[PDB]
């Protein structure tokens, strides 16, 4: 249910953190 | 005595932090849980040990000691008897309360009223 949106935001934050670490 | 319930749950009128956090609503049901069947365990490992002590000491022969062989079969017989008789004896009566099949019927005669 709400875990779908929570996981979407979690994935977005994880990808943003990986991008920040790479660049 | 029953533990207190005032000021425990989170409600509109409760001003303080909730104390108890129920997984399911604390409504007394109309049926009790079915009695749990006990998990079995191996029998007379102790007498099996003294049976095998004769075999380890006397080079694995039954003519050396005969009582340690006979009491092992005595254990086999008594364990089979306890497996057969008690499987019905413990399911018939509890000696402390009523069987669940009678308990559910007793509770259904005087059920709880969460509504109205």
């Amino acid at each position: 249910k709400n875990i779908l949106k929570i996981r979407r935001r979690k994935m977005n934050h994880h990808k943003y953190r990986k991008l920040v670490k790479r660049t | 005595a029953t533990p207190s319930l005032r000021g425990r749950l989170a409600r509109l009128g409760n001003p303080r932090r909730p104390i108890l956090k129920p997984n399911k609503p604390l409504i007394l049901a109309n049926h009790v849980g079915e009695r749990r069947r006990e998990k079995g365990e191996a029998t007379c490992i102790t007498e099996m040990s003294v049976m095998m002590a004769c075999w380890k000491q006397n080079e694995f022969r039954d003519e050396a000691c005969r009582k340690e062989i006979q009491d092992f079969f005595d254990c086999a017989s008594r364990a089979e008897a306890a497996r057969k008789m008690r499987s019905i004896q413990e399911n018939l009566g509890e000696l402390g309360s009523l069987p669940p099949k009678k308990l559910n019927k007793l509770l259904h005669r005087f059920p709880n009223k969460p509504h109205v």
Binding site: - | I45, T46, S49, V50
Partner: protein, 137 residues
Amino acid sequence: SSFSIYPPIPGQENSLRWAGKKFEEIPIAHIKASYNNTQIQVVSAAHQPLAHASCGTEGFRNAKKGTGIAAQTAGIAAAAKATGKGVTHVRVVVKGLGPGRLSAIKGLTMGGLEVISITDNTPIPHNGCRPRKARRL
């Protein structure tokens, strides 16, 4: 026959004897029943080790020494080594909660020792050292 389960503390003037000795002179059987091993050591009242026997010393192996049978055999051998030095009564002191707890206790009786008292000296820290993390993450 007024019998009390409370220990005979030396402070009182009670008259109880076991093989002619007081409760303060009867040897001790320290029995550490861990989750993977059971170690039995018989010391005297003067804290002199007399007999020592454990499931590891009984010729057992990694997982076979954790069963109650290994504890019973260790108790039997510890009882034999204790009787070798001329002891009749002992006070069992159980340390830790494990599978070889009662089995190694009855091992002394099977090996030829009389148990007069059982004391549960289990380590119960009042939130002292922090234990290890929980398994099955």
